[PDB]
Design a protein around this ligand. Sequence first.
Ligand SMILES: C[C@H](CCC(=O)O)[N+](C)(C)C
Ligand SMILES: C[C@H](CCC(=O)O)[N+](C)(C)C
Ligand SMILES: O=C(O)CNC(=O)C(=O)O
Ligand SMILES: O=C(O)CNC(=O)C(=O)O
Ligand SMILES: NCCCCCCN
Ligand SMILES: NCCCCCCN
Ligand SMILES: [Zn+2]
Ligand SMILES: [Zn+2]
Ligand SMILES: [Zn+2]
Ligand SMILES: [Zn+2]
Ligand SMILES: [Zn+2]
Ligand SMILES: [Zn+2]
Ligand SMILES: [Zn+2]
Ligand SMILES: [Zn+2]
Lengths: 384, 384
Amino acid sequence: MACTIQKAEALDGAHLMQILWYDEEESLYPAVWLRDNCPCSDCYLDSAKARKLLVEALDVNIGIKGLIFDRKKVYITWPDEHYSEFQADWLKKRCFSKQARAKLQRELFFPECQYWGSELQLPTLDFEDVLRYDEHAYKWLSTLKKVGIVRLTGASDKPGEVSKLGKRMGFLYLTFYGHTWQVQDKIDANNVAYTTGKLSFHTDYPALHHPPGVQLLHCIKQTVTGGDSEIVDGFNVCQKLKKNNPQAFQILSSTFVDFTDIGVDYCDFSVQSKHKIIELDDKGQVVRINFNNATRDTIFDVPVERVQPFYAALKEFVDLMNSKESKFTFKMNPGDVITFDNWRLLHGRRSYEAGTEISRHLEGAYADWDVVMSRLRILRQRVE
Amino acid sequence: MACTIQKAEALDGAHLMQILWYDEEESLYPAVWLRDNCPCSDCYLDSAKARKLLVEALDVNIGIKGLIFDRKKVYITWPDEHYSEFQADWLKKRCFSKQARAKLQRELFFPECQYWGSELQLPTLDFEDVLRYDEHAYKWLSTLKKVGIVRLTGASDKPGEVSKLGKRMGFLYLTFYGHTWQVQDKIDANNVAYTTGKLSFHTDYPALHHPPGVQLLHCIKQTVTGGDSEIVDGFNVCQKLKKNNPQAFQILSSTFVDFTDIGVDYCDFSVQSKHKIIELDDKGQVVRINFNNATRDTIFDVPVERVQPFYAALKEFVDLMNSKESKFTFKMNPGDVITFDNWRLLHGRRSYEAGTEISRHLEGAYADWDVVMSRLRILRQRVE
Ligand SMILES: C[C@H](CCC(=O)O)[N+](C)(C)C
Ligand SMILES: C[C@H](CCC(=O)O)[N+](C)(C)C
Ligand SMILES: O=C(O)CNC(=O)C(=O)O
Ligand SMILES: O=C(O)CNC(=O)C(=O)O
Ligand SMILES: NCCCCCCN
Ligand SMILES: NCCCCCCN
Ligand SMILES: [Zn+2]
Ligand SMILES: [Zn+2]
Ligand SMILES: [Zn+2]
Ligand SMILES: [Zn+2]
Ligand SMILES: [Zn+2]
Ligand SMILES: [Zn+2]
Ligand SMILES: [Zn+2]
Ligand SMILES: [Zn+2]
């Protein structure tokens, strides 16, 4: 009844098609959009699922010349004698009502989000299960997207596990630190990560204009002397900051901060960026946190009078992150893997003791959110 | 005289340091910024060129407790007995005046830009020279950044040339179409690029939220039956559009368009995005064009009444691109490589004739702008 056509007609000087469905609801489709999206082999390459029609071939003032229909299809003639057929279900799905458009966007982008503080129950799955079963890989990625983190247990205590998950997603994201990389204490460390020092809350790689969306960290070896992990939900903290201190929020979401990274690892590099620490979309929703205090530059491109207020804002923001209501602490063991949203979470670690042998070793990697979402879309379809 | 210290003092309740240089100019440095950027081994890890100091250790209300100086350094004591030394040249470079900050930004980001239309003289270098000499690789990347395109001649007529340039930059950008990819006519083409059809002006990969910054295309084999290349400077076209049709400009720079790509190539994929076709920074400057008509989705997430005005805007934009004053046409020969800014240029190709053997073959690859700029920074330093 809902996707069965009861009536189709051209309206509004034939610039619009209206469908009355059998459930009595109505949908409207501009004529230019219909012509633009003609599925015939002239206009549309089915093997690629892509449009061949050029913008240059589209009359933006086009009207429908003729229309007939049955319960399942509309058949249209155009002023220049082009001919088009559209299927009822295809039409129904693309209805321009706010409700139909929003529903489809949810299905494409999995916007569901569950904010958390210290009460977090760390979502946890088995590693081999995730590699083997789509049902488990689906739960893995959907929870990663919704909650921002998933732990995987039962991996080995050897290099190569993040690489297997990378393949399960599709491919990992290559950076100047390599395809994968080793978090251990190193002589002449090119990065504070590669020391025994404390890492306060940070996102990885704000020195890139497109920081890694997803981070993977696998504990190969762990020390008893320290090295606990800490996470906080950045979207949650930002919401509390806007509430408690709209001025601090305003400064952090509007000020461009310079980040830097110079050194040699996979290649030799001299990397520079600018980002707003709290990054808002066009509707004012926080979509990314860009913040690592180690790689924030000495160069600070703001007028002198904006400097101290910036720091006072940043301090309020860091204090919220450290608050006992926001922060969640745990300690990784050999064979544990954490996979998390590096645009949303900030993470850190406690200091631990140097010695003459390596007491602590994680292997990490990155992946692009688009690569991950693509796998998520495919998995959902296979599972449903 | 300009970077020699004539006087240093604490001012403004000791919250500011003022330096009077020997050229009689003055610079101001907030106390909190100085403490934040103390270069001592407690605060700063020299092997990483990174800050160890935590935000949590920074008193945002800090003042200078004592200060002494000579011609080349300032020596500061802090209220908690921490001690800091700063070098005159380091200080001079980071001066918070608008002029000093802007100068340094130019040096970091190479903003110089030369807009062009049909009068373009295609910048051209030798391929092997670029692989061999830093002077030539520097000219290559600086011109790529400034002009948006460089041709390289004298490559071979065999696969693997884009890969060599990838290494010269650092590394190539892996996508679902592979590390490198073959533009040829293919049975069951997963993409309109892999046909003999005309490609109108487009950027590559707006189906990703972070489209490739730089594209490389190497002609292995060329057909006489068609297949000429066309380019246009997108930043130039946008400027003309804002002038001629501010309404069209407003629609294109504000409307989110959905892009899609579903198929199998390097991996199986189902990719979705949203972008504004004309993408503006926070000051209203165009920083990216995101537009491929083949991969623009059938799904169009706007209210019905915005649809036709969107198309009328897009048509004005495409017509400008096609104008004889904007467009530059040329034809690639075996051994030619084009490297260009895929955020700024749009490119296309003329149709050509199918046959039973492959008459036309290019190999392409992508690179990230951050990877390229890093190499650019390193090269400049080596050459100067
Ligand atoms: C880049 C990260 C550290 C975070 C950063 O520098 O932003 N590595 C662990 C070294 C791979
Ligand atoms: C992605 C490009 C075409 C452009 C596009 O689909 O956006 N390939 C040539 C197939 C690698
Ligand atoms: O060592 C850890 O526990 C966490 N490591 C990092 O956050 C890093 O390397 O960037
Ligand atoms: O075939 C050409 O000349 C140009 N190719 C493309 O723009 C492409 O593959 O995306
Ligand atoms: N069942 C209706 C088919 C209509 C074909 C029209 C071709 N011009
Ligand atoms: N040449 C001046 C060195 C000052 C050292 C001060 C240590 N507190
Ligand atoms: Zn139906
Ligand atoms: Zn058609
Ligand atoms: Zn980290
Ligand atoms: Zn290298
Ligand atoms: Zn000097
Ligand atoms: Zn110090
Ligand atoms: Zn292309
Ligand atoms: Zn794969």
